[PDB]
Design a protein around this ligand. Sequence first.
Ligand SMILES: Nc1nc2c(ncn2[C@@H]2O[C@H](COP(=O)(O)OP(=O)(O)OP(=O)(O)O)[C@@H](O)[C@H]2O)c(=O)[nH]1
Ligand SMILES: Nc1nc2c(ncn2[C@@H]2O[C@H](COP(=O)(O)OP(=O)(O)OP(=O)(O)O)[C@@H](O)[C@H]2O)c(=O)[nH]1
Ligand SMILES: [Mg+2]
Ligand SMILES: [Mg+2]
Lengths: 433, 440, 49, 157, 151
Amino acid sequence: REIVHIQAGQCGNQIGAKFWEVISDEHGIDPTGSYHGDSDLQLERINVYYNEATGNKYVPRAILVDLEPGTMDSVRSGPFGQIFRPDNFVFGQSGAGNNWAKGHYTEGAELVDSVLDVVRKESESCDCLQGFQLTHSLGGGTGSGMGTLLISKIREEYPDRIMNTFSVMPSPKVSDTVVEPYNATLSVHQLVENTDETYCIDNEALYDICFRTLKLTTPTYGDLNHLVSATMSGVTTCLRFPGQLNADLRKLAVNMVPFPRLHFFMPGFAPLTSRGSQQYRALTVPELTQQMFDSKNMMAACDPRHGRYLTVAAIFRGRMSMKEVDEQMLNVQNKNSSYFVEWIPNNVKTAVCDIPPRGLKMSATFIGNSTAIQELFKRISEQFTAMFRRKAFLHWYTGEGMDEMEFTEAESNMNDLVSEYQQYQDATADEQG
Amino acid sequence: MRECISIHVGQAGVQIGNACWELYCLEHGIQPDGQMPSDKTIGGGDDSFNTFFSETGAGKHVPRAVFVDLEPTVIDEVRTGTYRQLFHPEQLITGKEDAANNYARGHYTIGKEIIDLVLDRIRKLADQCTGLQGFLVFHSFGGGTGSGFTSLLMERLSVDYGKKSKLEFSIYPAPQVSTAVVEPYNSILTTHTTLEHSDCAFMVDNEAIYDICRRNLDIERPTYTNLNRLISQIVSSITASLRFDGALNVDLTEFQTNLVPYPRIHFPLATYAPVISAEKAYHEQLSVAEITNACFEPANQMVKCDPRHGKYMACCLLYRGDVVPKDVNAAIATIKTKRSIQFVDWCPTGFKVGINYQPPTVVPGGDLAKVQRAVCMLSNTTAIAEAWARLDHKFDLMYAKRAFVHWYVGEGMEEGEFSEAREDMAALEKDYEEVGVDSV
Amino acid sequence: EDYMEEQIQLEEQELKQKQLKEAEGPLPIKAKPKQPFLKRGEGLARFTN
Amino acid sequence: EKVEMYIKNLQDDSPPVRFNAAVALGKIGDERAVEPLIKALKDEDWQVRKTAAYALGKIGDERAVEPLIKALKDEDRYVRSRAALALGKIGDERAVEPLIKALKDEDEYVRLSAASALGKIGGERVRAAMEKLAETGTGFARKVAVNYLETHKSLIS
Amino acid sequence: EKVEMYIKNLQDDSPPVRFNAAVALGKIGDERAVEPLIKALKDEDWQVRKTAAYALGKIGDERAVEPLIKALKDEDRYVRSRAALALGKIGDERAVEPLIKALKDEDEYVRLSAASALGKIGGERVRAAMEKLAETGTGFARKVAVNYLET
Ligand SMILES: Nc1nc2c(ncn2[C@@H]2O[C@H](COP(=O)(O)OP(=O)(O)OP(=O)(O)O)[C@@H](O)[C@H]2O)c(=O)[nH]1
Ligand SMILES: Nc1nc2c(ncn2[C@@H]2O[C@H](COP(=O)(O)OP(=O)(O)OP(=O)(O)O)[C@@H](O)[C@H]2O)c(=O)[nH]1
Ligand SMILES: [Mg+2]
Ligand SMILES: [Mg+2]
């Protein structure tokens, strides 16, 4: 039933804060914590992300972490900054300045036990904790380095729990930080081993959707974050409202992850909107289907046409025809049969929530485990090899006690992930022996 | 009397189970508070319902049922419903976390904790029985609880109630209502480990039910509520012989005597008719000849397969309502005069018949309408192996890649169990082919 | 990525002057603690038991 | 006023029609339906014969005693046992000796119904018969007799 | 015309077409097939000996009786069954005593094939075996016994 939410670093707390702003509007919860909605469905599965208090005043089960002290203050002054538990804010004396080693080994590993204590005080009040949900980015030192340290430490204390993450990908067109492929490769090594499900939210893909599709000539983080809000709200609908399919983190992992390490999901959303998009018209079920599966609507910079899907989950939202959805969803698999593995029959599962997202009358959310995600891991391997070849900034990491052999493990595991992802893409549904 | 205890496992088994009892109450005149009063009573002296319903010292008729689920959601809807009074609190057992569509989780990890408590509440019902016949197990093939916990419970029941019969009603998976990709794994795993502990299994192919819902009841996109109203209508006609005064399939042993030639081939096919949409009840009713012929149209089968692609081993026709025995005899003689209805050479070629004169019963305010006469044909055709073939193809499709297999091994199961379960289905399919292969 | 090579060479020039003064440590040269890490295939222990 | 309909239906060429009529005749329970329900006990269809036996007990008229006694020798188990339960409801001690013979029946339900009928009758005629049965009777019938005498002992032995 | 192709395919070192040969020999039926279908009942493969019984059973020759009785004491259940059902189709009364010996078989399906075949002969020794089976037999086999006795 209950999910424990953790947001680490600037990016972690920025996407994470927007998560609670969107889901609290859908669940009727106002900034004070009390309910003010209309539907009884809004509160049906409230216990997943909230804690009831005083006279039924709902508190998010969030743990806000960052080595930067200022991040604590920017969250509190947000729309829903007065709804978080004041004790769940674990903040350090100075950020890692985009140095993964500081967060995983020195500065971050001092703050970890304090966070674990908060994790415990929230896991102790769970009737039946189902797992964890970490929002962070792999580009810096705190969200990426300390975030992956929280993951291992949680996996050794809660080994039979689901570790679900929203991991933000670095792109040189979003951040000027040259050491970002080092941290992304070092975090991906940790994710590959200790996570059950990871939603690859690519900043390259968000920068591209804003520039190309939305025509925003000068994209900001708020415009990039708007896409993440739609995505996080969509991918979590299944666990937030009463449903049959993928209604818990474990049942979701059993339907999506065929191979222990191939748990990196390419999310997608339809329709693509940007804050202030007044001129619009409701989308039909055929439009939501074709868009949702298209590379233009992907939150990961990959083209699923250059790969095959192992599993997929479609979440439709709004008052729509359940026969029309089925027809479209069958037609998509029956036409594009060349983009789904034939040795996993019935791999696409479809859920429909009657309650649509904020402002929208209808929407569709795509979660795909595609072999074409290797196009994201090749980008980070080329960018990492570019720096690791000339051995740039290695002193910055090894100086904090970090081993050089860890960069070789992180690299040799990410290349193995790409070779496993391709072995299943070229795999034939054959019986030769 | 000669009592039967029903055990409902997982969401599907619990859901179908409650819909069956709802119908049982209407058939026998029982109200949702256990009361059987002058008004709703049938008369005629039919006290055969006492095998499914115990009686308190205050005319309260309580179902001999057990409801088990590793999660509260489905059973909480029972204790908060119309029939929240009908069952004793201890008959509804719930866990805190389910088996997440994983057979190994229900059979081994979660299941091993609630197994001993369930045997306790079963024994408490078996104690109020002067002559317990056996168990009726309702569960899904695809659920973690349905496939795994049921398998575990059947292994235990054989140890604790050796001389008693075990008869299942298993929801077979449909892509139109599939909750998980591992549904074929769970179905093959449960069938293998349950094969020696069950004496008679009635598969309810959910696709076959969805098809009847779409065609006969005119339901574009049937929900589980729609599917459940139909499955209860069919399962009730199968279990009515056990709860009413009759001459055919009177007790649990008779199901095996009349339908199971030898133990492994214990999967009879139910074909219920007529299924009529509520909007079409005020048209002249179908005759005994019309509905007897309908049992031989595969469109009305509870499991999708073609009986013409196999051979028969047994056939039981259980009529209900305005059926005149002479009309049945004429309709049967007409069936016997058909070279397409082929029996195996090693089995006797005949049709056992039973007519219950009590008018048929439907849920008021339901997609199904009330008929004057209906029949259910329980046939054991070697063409039920078509249903296993579809599962085995999807099982081999993934097991050749070891897809999802990790979820099972990490939950107290061994990889060799998948090889072991599939060798049993290869043995079963080769057996079904090798027995219906000939006749002259 | 013209800013990329401009920062790599800046770091090479800055890590050559910083190491010119920081290469005269005292008493038995003891090695700096090499930290243990996650080794490839370690996260696959959950699905084996 | 509807009793007139169900009496003629009791002998309609259609067995489900005579059945449904015998069911309704027991639910109504009239003096007028006693004689036609006595004719129904000789019907060739057992489902109709068994329903008449119950209906004759719910109505409970003395006239049904002799015809219900001869139904205890019927080829059908539900007719024998359902007739014994009617003889227990009526309570006429003429049923006592035929009911003691039904304790050696092949079917268990008939044996059980007969013992329950012997108990529903009671009186000095059943008591004397059970004292003798617990000496010259064996197996189940002996067990029925020893239970009868013990459940009807006026003192704590 | 082309019946001699399958007539010598019984002594083939390759088992695929060897089993397929008896499947077509029994469907066509020639007076020359009587001799090689007897040699197919002494194979190492079960699919070969069981397909030979159905081929020799359709061709109702007495030459099949003597070896088909030895096929009732086979290591396989499918061979024994089709061999018992072949005896029932031919009708030789000397096959009654060995079919009664098959009713007390390890395989519950061999006992039903033998009972079906013994019922097909329907002699007087069969009448006592079917009265005995209607008391000393499983719920399904006791029901087969009483359906034959209703004659
Ligand atoms: N989409 C998105 N990316 C962000 C946001 N804020 C920062 N990032 C990205 O996060 C990466 C840098 O990591 P940060 O989260 O800023 O750093 P940190 O986790 O606080 O760690 P330190 O900088 O070492 O203290 C780069 O890829 C940034 O583009 C945001 O609100 N939205
Ligand atoms: N007819 C019918 N089928 C159902 C129902 N609920 C689920 N099913 C089917 O049963 C299969 C899934 O099994 P479930 O019963 O939901 O699972 P469970 O036994 O509770 O097991 P876990 O939840 O995994 O612990 C799928 O084929 C479903 O479509 C229902 O109410 N009616
Ligand atoms: Mg920061
Ligand atoms: Mg369930």
